[PDB]
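Here is the promised in-class demo. Please do not try to memorize the tokens; focus on the logic of going from shape to residues.
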């Protein structure tokens, strides 16, 4: 069992990206964040419950559930923009 296939969804668009284990949440975020840009939020949905990936702990929790399932092949991770960016320049007082 090598190469982790992760399916990312953004505004309906789908993308297939493979990862070589061991895979670190920090490393994945750095790569994904650059692909779609920043700042962005990582939303993970299993089926009935949804958990926001904040730390590596949440990352391993997702895999554990997937391993138990017979459909352990791809991952359903949806990322969405937080709407409105913070980058002011200048203004009158």
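The designed amino acids, position by position:
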């Amino acid at each position: 069992q090598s190469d982790v296939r992760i399916k990312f969804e953004h505004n309906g668009e789908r993308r297939i990206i493979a990862f070589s284990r061991p895979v670190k949440y920090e490393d994945v975020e750095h790569k994904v964040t650059t692909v779609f840009g920043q700042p962005l939020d990582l939303h993970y949905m299993n089926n009935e419950l949804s958990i926001l990936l904040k730390n590596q702990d949440d990352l391993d929790k997702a895999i554990d559930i997937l391993d138990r399932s017979s459909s352990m092949k791809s991952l359903r991770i949806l990322l969405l923009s937080q709407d409105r960016n913070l980058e002011h320049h200048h203004h009158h007082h």
